[model samples]
Target: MKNFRDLGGNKTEDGRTVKKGLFYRSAKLSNLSENDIKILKELNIKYIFDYRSDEEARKHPSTIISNIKNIRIPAMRELGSIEDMIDGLFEKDGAFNMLNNSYYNLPINNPSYKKLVELIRDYSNLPILNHCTAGKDRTGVGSAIILMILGVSRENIMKDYLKSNDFADKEIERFIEYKPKFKDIPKENLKYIFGVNEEYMKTAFRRIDEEYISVEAYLYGEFNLNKEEIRKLRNQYLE
Candidate 1:
């Protein structure tokens, strides 16, 4: 099974529910079987926002599906190179620190964050899928921001963020096997890279709060989303 999930059924603060079937989140589409392809086709996904870097995409190209527009919006260009890890130069702590720091930077520094907001602003892009290699870091931040715009409560957002861990077991195993250095890393440290934890998301949220005062403010200032745009987003996504 894939880590695919519908970003639906969650209640917002104002007694409204996020409409199901309009949005989806998942890991890479590289491993889709024929059955998985059939299931995804049933979703009628129109657009895919891929957050993988060029190197990663070249190594594990996403499976092509008919009639879907795939947009490559690399999230962490700075850490796209794997040679450092392959060379055994990056220790577990160093790798963990890089990941932790990425959580803090992604919300503010990634250009794709603003692009995702812009695309979501247009209702035509409904039934869109957003993903990264693991669908837990870049994708997680993007999903969290979208949910915040939709007025979803922090508790539910955190719940959604934590759900990645449940479906990431196989992905993590494959990741470790891909590189000998990865196998040598401790599980505790690997959690920062392969697993989704509450603290990682909290770190991003905290950074947004510290610099922009709130998600709303950050969206407004960075994404140029005005009051009307924000309202449109909520009304479009929320029931």
Candidate 2:
């Protein structure tokens, strides 16, 4: 199925395009049909940065051609066996309340956040497709940072973040029905599963502002990304 969107259409404050194909984000590739692979192959993808857990990646490995590099950079350390987490959320506690909470905490003192920034900066020149199981929080945070540096307005960032809800409707529906008590949780609150919300991103931005003055400062201090790397990243990834 055609599952990805061209986020390049998103407008930045300076009225420049983000450029298509250079930086595309989407849902997991494990279920990509042969036809979908053919379509994606045409996009000239240089790398696929998967943000799923090791167990998740093992279960549904992507079907990239041997030439395309597939990198596994999980967003969180596994709390326990993936099976146990799945069972606890779906069959036991229900609603995945704890899971949702965990995602909100991802940008705070989370090793994944720093690692992801470094990766994004390092891979800025190539045609990269970064994704998690749902391509929301973990993927969204990376996208937001990259886009912000490219001059995208915060409003546009939030708009892009919310798009995951529409993109993963079927998957979310299945999860919700798998445990009905979660039906009480509004789809918006499901940001935990889809992507970061405005407030969550703002919280992260605020933290950076308070501690480091700006995102650039945060990147340099926290991720150890040098000025040359950041400049190269902006030039390579932005229009």
Candidate 3:
């Protein structure tokens, strides 16, 4: 439940604001307490979009809710595990480069996000909550693309992207404590592995910025959406 937030209330370029309570983004949903389930149930969430690979999901599965539908589309197909990320940590900025490179690759050409966009067009699947393990990198780009398609301002989109830092700060401490090898790693290097940075998300944005005429163009090309379909999606999500 860490890094969770309602993806709402941002002003789009067309002067429309995204509707609240329809979209959510978060970290993993494992080991929830009673109150967590209570809040989740009350939110009336309809869909949980899981971006973790089969290995990650098998090892750390999400809490299954009886009524909510969960869809698994592995985002970064067979990117190394977190422990393997640790194996790469001896190289200066290895974790940082790995994640930055992932951002570069994920925004426009990735098939996983293309499917996410398609599912979002279905109105019945809203109040949708999407996440990766830490809800930063994989969830980060997916959330960004959706906001971009909604025509939300870049400032607001980055603001949401960086919000994961707040939760990461707290979570990474216990994360490091659990791993004995992480104790010797420098704090600066560790942040890249377990925490987040503004530069990380921007790498994805810069790719989209350079590669497309507009976010709409990216959506049209990457998500295979027609202009009319884009218009219909906006009409469904915006007030």
Candidate 4:
């Protein structure tokens, strides 16, 4: 449950709010304790969108909730590869470079993220929980997109993105505990790996503006979702 939290209560431009308990984001759930499992059960999550590859998921197998549809999205392929990220740990500002690269490429033709959006369009698949290994980079990008679709302002979306930093100490320690190589890496640098920074997501916003003109246009061109369709999704998740 590292970095676990609800993506609800944020106000949109129209004063609509995202409904609580309908959207959850977290790190890998493989480490959940019995108490954590109980809390998850209480949430009654419907879809668990895992953004890990088969290899990554195998190493950190998530806890299986009986009825939740645990869909694997593998959002970190090609430019988002973990090896590329790992390679940056030794080089100065390498992690930052890799993070910016991922964010810059996040709002593009990624089918995995598109699937996540498409599924949420159906209300029945809601109370959905999405996660990547650390639940920062991939999950951050996807969560920002969801907020934008809900009409949230760019400032609020970035605030939500930076909220992941609240779990940085635990997340970085946990990651280093698993792979001690990160132990020697400076904490300042490790933040770029396990947590997040303003510049990382700004890169995404910049890319969206440069490529799609706006998140709305990105949805139209990439996912084929229009203004009306986005409003329909907002109706499903908003109060």
Winner by lDDT: 3
Give lDDT tens digits, candidate 1, residues 1-239.
Answer: 35678888989988999999988998889967888778778888889898888888999998888888899888776443543533442566465556667898888867887788788888888789999887888889999988888889889999999888866666567777876566776654555556777778888888888998766788788888877888878788888
Clashes of each: 0, 3, 0, 0
Give the alpha-carbon lDDT of every model.
0.80, 0.66, 0.84, 0.83
* Full ranking by lDDT: 3, 4, 1, 2
C-alpha TM-score for every candidate: 0.85, 0.74, 0.87, 0.87
**TM match of model 3 to true structure:** 0.87
Which candidate model has the greater lDDT, 2 or 4? 4
What TM-score would you give candidate 2 relative to the actual structure? Answer: 0.74
State residue 160's C-alpha deviation in candidate 1, in Å. 0.6
Which segments of model 3 are wrong by more than 4 Å? 79-93, 176-189
Stretches > 4 Å off in candidate 1: 79-93, 171-190
Please state every model's RMSD to the true fold in angstroms: 3.4, 4.7, 2.8, 3.3
lDDT of 4 by residue, 1-239 (tens): 78888989999999889899888898888977888878888889888898888798888888877777789978867335433666666576666775688788878888788998898888888888989987888899888878888899999998888888879877677777888865787776667766789998899889888987777888899788999998788887789
> What local lDDT score does residue 193 receive in model 4, on the 0 to 100 scale?
68
Q: Between prediction 1 and prediction 3, which has the larger TM-score?
A: 3
lDDT of 2 by residue, 1-239 (tens): 32366567667676667777777888778767787878767887777777789888888888766556887777777865433444454444543555544545555565655655655665543677777776776777767766766668778888887777676566657767777766776665453443344555665566657777766676677677677876676566566
